[PDB]
Nucleic acid binder design. Structure first.
Ligand SMILES: [Zn+2]
Ligand SMILES: [Zn+2]
Lengths: 100, 165, 45, 332, 180, 50, 100
DNA sequence: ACTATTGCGAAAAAAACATTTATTTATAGTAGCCGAAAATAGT
DNA sequence: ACTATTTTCGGCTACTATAAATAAATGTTTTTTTCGCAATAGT
C-alpha cells in the first residue's frame, strides 16, 4: 500500500531551482512554458525502498523510504515541451504523459 | 409537494418495477393459505425479481400469533406442570420447542400476574383436565410404561446371538 | 496559481494532492496543465 | 564509494560525452571506467489453490489486481497465525478481501461477497470480527457512504445530466453529515435515501424498487428515513421549493434519546457496595445446606403417582432414547 | 449525577464430588427439561429467586439468573436441596464467580465516530453489524459496549468490584466529546 | 468444469444457481482478444498452426 | 452493443479519449440464456460475457456517419479513413493475408 | 474378450480445531409479516 | 354520498451483535494414505 510521490525542487542558497531544476514546476511535474536542455530533470519520481517487503500489520516506521528515480532529458540539442497531461488507466492507476 | 410518492415526470422503464412490486405481494399470499391449511413450470426472469437485502438467507420467521383457544391449553398445562416445554411442543402440533419458550418469556413481561398465579398453583386444579389427560392419551393408544420395555429386551437378546455367532 | 484545467469542461481546479483524478462539473478523467506565468526568452529567427 | 586521493563520498556519473564514467567533483579522479551494462510444498500447494480463489471473485466483482495481490499477504500472515484451520476455506478469504477493500477505501460493500456465497451477512461477518481483533489491526478507514453516491448512479442508467444529480446529492450529503441521523445506523441505509431525494426533484426514477435493487436495503426502512429527515429541522422549507443554498446547523437530535425522553469532586473509595459482605451473608458450610431452607422448594418434588404419568409421554416422544440402546448393542 | 450501575445477572459454577445421572434427576422432578440430542443436561426454572439451574452430566453445575450476589447463594443451595432428595453427594466447595453484567444510562447523546478516530489506535467497531461501539480497556482488562442514547452495558466482568472504578475511569473520555 | 464440481455435492444441488459463476470465466475472452491483437501471434487448436 | 430493455444506441468512451488513457476501444457482448434453475426452468436476458473490440468507422461505432460537428465534438479528424483497432493504447491493423 | 499392467481416485482417517449444544443479562436496528386503522376513491 | 379497499401505521415477532462459562458432539479443515477402479495394452 505504498504509492509514488512527485516531490521536487530541493532548495539551495535562497533559491529553489538547481541547474537541473529550473524547469521542474511547483508540483514536481515539469512546468509547461519553457525549454529544457541536457540534464535538467523534468519529471521527478521517488519510489519506496520496501518494494518487495511483506506488509507489517502495524504503524511503526514509515516516514522516510523514498529513493529517487528521476527522468532526465537526454539529447545533444535543447528542446521544448509541447504540453503535459495526467490521467488514470482502466484500473485505478495514475498515468503521466508529457510530449516534447 | 411532500416527499412521500409524488408523480412528477417521464419515469421510463417503470413497468418492470411496477410488474414486480405487484407480483411480490402475491408471494406471501399463497404462503398465507398454506399456513391456514396446515392448521386444519416455465418462468421468465425479470431483473428486479431476485433482488436481495440484509434480510435474506438467514434463520428465523414469523410465528403464527397465539389464540384464546390455545390459552386454555397453555395456562392449565402451566398450572399442572411447573414448566415443561417437551410435551407442550407436541400439544401444539406444528409449533416448535423454541417459540413456546419465547412465549413464556413474552408472557412474563406481558402478564406478570398470571404466571405467578400458575407458580403459586401447586395442587390439582378445577377438575376439567381429565378429558385433556385422555385427549393426550387417545393418540396411538398403547402402553408406554409396560409395553415399551420388551423392545430393549428383544434387542439385547439379539446381541447375545451375535456374541454366540 | 492558474492551476489544473479540464479537457472539455475547461475548469480551473486546484485539486489537492493524492485525492482525486477526475474533474468537477463533468465525469471526465483526463487532465490538462495550464501554462505558467513566468516569462520565457526566445529569438526571432 | 570512497576515493583513493580525497576519500570523497559523492560520486557523479558524467553522461556529457557518452562515456558514462564515474567521478567525484572534489578532485576529479575517475572511480570506474568502461561500464559493464547488464545486457512446505503442502504450504505451497494450499496457497496455489488460494491464489486461484482470490483471482476468481475479483474477476466477478471487477476488483483491480493491486488489491488481489495486496490481499494475499493479508492471507499469508493469518496462514502463519493458525487462523485457517477449522474454518471454511471459502469463508475466510472473502473476509480477507474486505480488509484490503477497506484499506483501499473502495465502493465495494460486504453483502456483495455473501450474496454470491449465498450465506447470511452475519455468517461471513462473524469471522470478520475474529480476524481483526486477533491479528491486531488497530488503524482502519471508516466506511464513508459518500463514495456510494458516486458509484450507484452508473448502473442506475439515469439521464445524461448525471452530474447535477450527484453534485446536489453530495451537497445534500454534506448537509446530511451535519444532521443527526446516522450515528450508529447503516452506512448503506442513510446513503440510499439522499439519492432518492436528489433524483426526486428532477426526475421520477423513484419507484422504491429500482433503488432497492441498487442499495440492497428494504423499502420500509428508507421510507422511515424519508419521514425522519423531513421532521428534524428546516426540511419543510425545502420540501416543495427553496433551491439548495441553505447554510444552517439546526438542532442536534439523534432519534435514540428522543425515545428516551418519551419514556419519562470524584467518587469516594468506600462509597459503593462491596462484594465480600455478600459472601459473608450465608455461612459457607461446604456439605451442609440446611440454612437456606423453605417450604416450597422442599415441596419442589414429583407427584408420586404421576411418575407413571410423566414417564408415559416422556417415552411416548421417544426416538433418541430408543436408538441409544440400538447403538450401544451395535458397539459391542 | 452520581448514578450507580445496576447489576442484573450472575453466572457461577460449582463442582460436585458425585457424578450426575440423568435418569434419576429428570423423571421425578417438576421442571423437567432433558432432550439429549438438543442438550446434554437438564435445566431447572424457578421464579423465586427467578434464577436458573444448569447441571452437567459429569457432575458439575453452574447457576445463572440472580440479581444480587447473595441472591445467587441462597439459590445455589436450594438447587442442591432437591439433590438432597436423591441419594447424591452434592459436595460443593468453591463458589467461583466469573461474569456479573450491568447496564447503565447517562442520558445525553454523544459522538462516537469522533472517538473512533481519536481513540481508534486501541478501540474500534463496525457500524453495520452492531449499532454500537465495542470498547476495550487495558487497565481492568474489560470489554464493554457503548451506544448513542447514553446507555452502556457492561459485560465480561469476572469480578464485581473491578467495573466500579473502571466505569468511573471511562466517564471523562465520554464527556470529552461534547459534540461541539 | 466448474459446474459438476458443485454438482458433486448432496446439499448444493437444489438451490444452486449457475449465473453467479459466469464472470470468472468471462475474463479469458477479452484478455485473449487484446493479447492476440497486441502480440500478432495466434495459437490455434483445431488447426494447430502458428 | 445495446440491451433489449433500454434499446438506446449506446453510451461509449470516445476513441480519441480512449487512446489517451491506453485503454481498449471495445464493445460489450450481450447473450440471452435459458436453463433449469431447479423446480422450474428460467430464461434470463442480456448477460455480460465479454467486451470485443470494434474497428472505427464501422456501423457499430459512434463515428458512423457523422456531420463534422458530432465528430468535431469528439475532436476526431474527418479525413481519417479509419479501419483499425485502438486496443490498450497503440493502433494496429490486421494485414490481409492469403494462401493458395 | 481374458488377462495383465497402472496410475489414478476417491475415500478413509487423523489430528486438529474452531463450531454448535443450550442459559440470561439489555439496546437499538432492521426486517419480515399483520392486522388496525384510516384515508380515499369507485359508484 | 355509500361501498369498498388500498394506503397508512404501527404491532408483532424475530434476531444476530455481549462475555462466560460447559460440553457432547459437530461441523469441517489440510494432510495423508490407502485402496479400488478402470485403463491401457498386450495376451
Ligand atoms: Zn469537468
Ligand atoms: Zn575522489
Amino acid at each position: 500500500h505504498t504509492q509514488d510521490i512527485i516531490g521536487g525542487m530541493r532548495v539551495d542558497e535562497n533559491g529553489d531551482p538547481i541547474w537541473q531544476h529550473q524547469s521542474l514546476g511547483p508540483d514536481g511535474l515539469g512546468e509547461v512554458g519553457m525549454k529544457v536542455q541536457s540534464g535538467q530533470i523534468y519529471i521527478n519520481k521517488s519510489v519506496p525502498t520496501n518494494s518487495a517487503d511483506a506488509p507489517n500489520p502495524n504503524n511503526v516506521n514509515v516516514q522516510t523510504q523514498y529513493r529517487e528515480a528521476p527522468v532526465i532529458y537526454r539529447g545533444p540539442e535543447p528542446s521544448h515541451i509541447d504540453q503535459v497531461m495526467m490521467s488514470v488507466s482502466d484500473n485505478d492507476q495514475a498515468l503521466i504523459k508529457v510530449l516534447l | 409537494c411532500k416527499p412521500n410518492f409524488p408523480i412528477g415526470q417521464i419515469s421510463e422503464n417503470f413497468e418492470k418495477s411496477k410488474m414486480a412490486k405487484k407480483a411480490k405481494l402475491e408471494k406471501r399470499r399463497h404462503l398465507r393459505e398454506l399456513r391456514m391449511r396446515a392448521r386444519q413450470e416455465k418462468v421468465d426472469e425479470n431483473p428486479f425479481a431476485n433482488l436481495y437485502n440484509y434480510g435474506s438467507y438467514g434463520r428465523g420467521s414469523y410465528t403464527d400469533p397465539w389464540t384464546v383457544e390455545e390459552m386454555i391449553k397453555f395456562y392449565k398445562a402451566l398450572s399442572m406442570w411447573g414448566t415443561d416445554f417437551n410435551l407442550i411442543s407436541q400439544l401444539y402440533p406444528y409449533r416448535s420447542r423454541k417459540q413456546v419458550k419465547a412465549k413464556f418469556v413474552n408472557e412474563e413481561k406481558k402478564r406478570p400476574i398470571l404466571i405467578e398465579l400458575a407458580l403459586r398453583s401447586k395442587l390439582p386444579p378445577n377438575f376439567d383436565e381429565y378429558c385433556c389427560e385422555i385427549k393426550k392419551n387417545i393418540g396411538t393408544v398403547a402402553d408406554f410404561n409396560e409395553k415399551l420395555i420388551e423392545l430393549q429386551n428383544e434387542h439385547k437378546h439379539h446381541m447375545k446371538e451375535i456374541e454366540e455367532a | 496559481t492558474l492551476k489544473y484545467i479540464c479537457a472539455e469542461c475547461s475548469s480551473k481546479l486546484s485539486l489537492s494532492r493524492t485525492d482525486a483524478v477526475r474533474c468537477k462539473d463533468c465525469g471526465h478523467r483526463i487532465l490538462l496543465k495550464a501554462r505558467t506565468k513566468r516569462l520565457v526568452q526566445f529569438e526571432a529567427r | 564509494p570512497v576515493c583513493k586521493n580525497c576519500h570523497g563520498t559523492e560520486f557523479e556519473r558524467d553522461l556529457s560525452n557518452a562515456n558514462n564514467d564515474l567521478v567525484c567533483k572534489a578532485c576529479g579522479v575517475v572511480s570506474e571506467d568502461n561500464p559493464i551494462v547488464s545486457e512446505l510444498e503442502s504450504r505451497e500447494a494450499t496457497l496455489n489453490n488460494a491464489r486461484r480463489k482470490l483471482r476468481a471473485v475479483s474477476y466477478a466483482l471487477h476488483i483491480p489486481e493491486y488489491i488481489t495481490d495486496a490481499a494475499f499477504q493479508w492471507y499469508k500472515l493469518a496462514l502463519a497465525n493458525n487462523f485457517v484451520q477449522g474454518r471454511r476455506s471459502q469463508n475466510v478469504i472473502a473476509s480477507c478481501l474486505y480488509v484490503a477493500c477497506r484499506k483501499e477505501k473502495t465502493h465495494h460493500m460486504l453483502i456483495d461477497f455473501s450474496s454470491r456465497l449465498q450465506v447470511s451477512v452475519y455468517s461471513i461477518g462473524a469471522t470478520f470480527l475474529k480476524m481483526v481483533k486477533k491479528l491486531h489491526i488497530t488503524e482502519l478507514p471508516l466506511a464513508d457512504p459518500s463514495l456510494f453516491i458516486q458509484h450507484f448512479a452508473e448502473k442506475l442508467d439515469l439521464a445524461d445530466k448525471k452530474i447535477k444529480v450527484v453534485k446536489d446529492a453530495v451537497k445534500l450529503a454534506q448537509r446530511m453529515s451535519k444532521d443527526w441521523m446516522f450515528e450508529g445506523r447503516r452506512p448503506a441505509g442513510i446513503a440510499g435515501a439522499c439519492i432518492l431525494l436528489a433524483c426526486r426533484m428532477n426526475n421520477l426514477r423513484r419507484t422504491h424498487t429500482e433503488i432497492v435493487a441498487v442499495s440492497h436495503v428494504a423499502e420500509e426502512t428508507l421510507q422511515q428515513r424519508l419521514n425522519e429527515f423531513k421532521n428534524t429541522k428546516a426540511a419543510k422549507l425545502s420540501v416543495q421549493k427553496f433551491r439548495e443554498n441553505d447554510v444552517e446547523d439546526g438542532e442536534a437530535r439523534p432519534p435514540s434519546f428522543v425515545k428516551n425522553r418519551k419514556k419519562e469532586c470524584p467518587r469516594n473509595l468506600h462509597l459503593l457496595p462491596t462484594t465480600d459482605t455478600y459472601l459473608s451473608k450465608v455461612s459457607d458450610d461446604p456439605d451442609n445446606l440446611e440454612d437456606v431452607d423453605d417450604e416450597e422448594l422442599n415441596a419442589h418434588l414429583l407427584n408420586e403417582e404421576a411418575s407413571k404419568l410423566k414417564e408415559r409421554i416422556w417415552i411416548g416422544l421417544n426416538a433418541d432414547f430408543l436408538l441409544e440402546q440400538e447403538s450401544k448393542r451395535l458397539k459391542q | 449525577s452520581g448514578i450507580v450501575p445496576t447489576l442484573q445477572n450472575i453466572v457461577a459454577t460449582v463442582t460436585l464430588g458425585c457424578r450426575l445421572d440423568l435418569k434419576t434427576v429428570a423423571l421425578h422432578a417438576r421442571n423437567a427439561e432433558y432432550n439429549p440430542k438438543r442438550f446434554a443436561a437438564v435445566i431447572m426454572r424457578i421464579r423465586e429467586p427467578k434464577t436458573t439451574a444448569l447441571i452437567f452430566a459429569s457432575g458439575k453445575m453452574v447457576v445463572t439468573g440472580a440479581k444480587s450476589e447473595d441472591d445467587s447463594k441462597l439459590a445455589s443451595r436450594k438447587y442442591a436441596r432437591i439433590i438432597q432428595k436423591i441419594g447424591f453427594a452434592a459436595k460443593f466447595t468453591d463458589f467461583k464467580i466469573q461474569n456479573i453484567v450491568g447496564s447503565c444510562d447517562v442520558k445525553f447523546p454523544i459522538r462516537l465516530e469522533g472517538l473512533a478516530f481519536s481513540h481508534g489506535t486501541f478501540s474500534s467497531y463496525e457500524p453495520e453489524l452492531f449499532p454500537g461501539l465495542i470498547y476495550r480497556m487495558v487497565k481492568p482488562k474489560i470489554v464493554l459496549l457503548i451506544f448513542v442514547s447514553g446507555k452502556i452495558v457492561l459485560t465480561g466482568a469476572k469480578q464485581r468490584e473491578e467495573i466500579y472504578q473502571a466505569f468511573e475511569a471511562i466517564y471523562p473520555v465520554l464527556s470529552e466529546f461534547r459534540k461541539m | 468444469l466448474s459446474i459438476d464440481k458443485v454438482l458433486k455435492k448432496p446439499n448444493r444441488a437444489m438451490e444452486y444457481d449457475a449465473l453467479l459463476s459466469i464472470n470468472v470465466h468471462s475474463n479469458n475472452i477479452t484478455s485473449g482478444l487484446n493479447r492476440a491483437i497486441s502480440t500478432g501471434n495466434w495459437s490455434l487448436k483445431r488447426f494447430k498452426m502458428e | 452493443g445495446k440491451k433489449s430493455s433500454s434499446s438506446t444506441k449506446d453510451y461509449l468512451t470516445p476513441p480519441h479519449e480512449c487512446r489517451l488513457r491506453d485503454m481498449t476501444y471495445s464493445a460489450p457482448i450481450y447473450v440471452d440464456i435459458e436453463y433449469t434453475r431447479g423446480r422450474n426452468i428460467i430464461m434470463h436476458k442480456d448477460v455480460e460475457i465479454g467486451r470485443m473490440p470494434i474497428m472505427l468507422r464501422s456501423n457499430k461505432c459512434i463515428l458512423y456517419d457523422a456531420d463534422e460537428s458530432k465528430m468535431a465534438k469528439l475532436n476526431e479528424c474527418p479525413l481519417d479513413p479509419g479501419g483499425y483497432f485502438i486496443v490498450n493504447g497503440t493502433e494496429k491493423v490486421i494485414l490481409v493475408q492469403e494462401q493458395l
